[PDB]
Amino acid sequence: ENNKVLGFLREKGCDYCHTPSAELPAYYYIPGAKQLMDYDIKLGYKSFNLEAVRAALLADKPVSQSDLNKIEWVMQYETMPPTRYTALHWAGKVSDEERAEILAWIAKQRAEYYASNDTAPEHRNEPVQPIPQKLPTDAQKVALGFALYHDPRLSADSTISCAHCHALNAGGVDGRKTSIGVGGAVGPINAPTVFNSVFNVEQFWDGRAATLQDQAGGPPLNPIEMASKSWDEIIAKLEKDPQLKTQFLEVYPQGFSGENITDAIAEFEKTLITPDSPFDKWLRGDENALTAQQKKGYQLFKDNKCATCHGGIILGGRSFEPLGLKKDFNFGEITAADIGRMNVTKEERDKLRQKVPGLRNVALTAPYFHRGDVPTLDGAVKLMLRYQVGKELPQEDVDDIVAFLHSLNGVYTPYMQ
């Protein structure tokens, strides 16, 4: 049944536009439309990478939620292949039968791997899931991580803790365009929320850190941020604190180290989740948790492809997408921060790609985009319609999507109670 889906993808010529492609032979091309056809071949690949899906299918593994979300969408609205190629020898039209089957195969992929038991039956096939209400953690290590998160001694100055860039009462963020580090260093990119970071595939806009623990070793030693020379410098200061040291040795009787401080902080960060958004309560069957407008907004959100990228538990955070997918973005000049994932991979296709932001709590993490230059949700939604979807929408529909986004404010239970 995996093989049935693979047979279909091969049959219909999807791989011609959604894999890395040689210049095709001349008899594939429509006279008068060679350029549009080359542009379509490239945009296909930029938009959707079928080699990822083929690879997962053949190891019998889960297809990513973004890839299911994309495929569902194209099947739902009957977009693929583009209708102008379907009378060609190499590209097939897709029948109602076949569409219904793919849509069914997605639904059982989502049921096997992604849907949660506690969401209402009617909503188990959504491209999105509620935040789990609890993650298992080690309570003693959480208490350490909580103290270290808020300890300015990890910075050269002893003035900056993690909280300076990620205040837990202000959405996990500093509310600045980009963050201000030691010596007043102005940083290169907008600081994302620590809320629900645990659900990201990888951490940092470029995805250069694999886990929360690896991420936590970054800012302490980054000259642009906390700017400590070494863990030795930091520990020489933490060592003079009995209360903290005594508690620390209780866990990790090895003593202070980068490994162990980053581990403590990471464990704390697994408690920085925000379940019971009005949206999540609605996914769990409470029909009155959303307004009429927010339900419409949610429908619009799916209709305009937002859930293709912003899917899963945190409505994003799961994949790397180019800023300017469907239309070149007005960078003015492209900086190293705009280059994004390519800094990590060195791959041309990753140029300008950026971890899709989870939209959980987005109403609380202004300003927006990685540049920190988009001050409102109205703006961010419009800019995403133009550049990521290739579309305009009337005001009233934008207002509705924005209302829906306000529904994603979860509930953080403060550590101390």
Ligand code: HEC
């Ligand atoms: C202190 C120990 C912490 C912890 C636990 C975190 N931060 Fe920050 N942070 C800052 C900026 C600008 C970014 C994005 C940087 C980039 O992409 O290059 C981050 C990123 C993170 C993440 C990743 C989250 C994600 O969704 O990708 C996490 C989990 C995180 N931080 C936690 C800015 C700052 C600071 C500015 C001066 C300081 C200080 C810190 N961070 C410190 C910490």
Ligand code: HEC
């Ligand atoms: C409906 C059409 C969509 C809405 C509504 C939003 N998106 Fe996206 N999105 C994508 C990326 C790669 C980013 C980060 C961009 C950057 O580098 O500046 C975003 C960002 C947003 C944001 C801002 C969130 C924040 O700053 O933390 C919002 C509010 C947002 N998106 C809403 C990627 C994609 C994507 C990929 C192809 C699509 C189809 C969409 N986004 C669609 C929507």
Ligand code: HEM
């Ligand atoms: C059944 C075969 C195919 C499947 C399953 C498929 C799937 C997809 C998917 C998942 C997307 C991403 C969703 C999106 O960005 O809108 C997409 C977009 C795209 N595909 Fe394909 N595709 C197929 C065939 C083709 C072919 C043969 C071409 C080119 C001749 C092509 C060109 C594109 C283009 C240009 C886009 C960007 C769409 C846009 O902006 O409207 N696709 N396709």
Ligand SMILES: [Ca+2]
């Ligand atoms: Ca055909």
Ligand SMILES: [Ca+2]
């Ligand atoms: Ca922001």
Ligand SMILES: [Cl-]
């Ligand atoms: Cl995923």
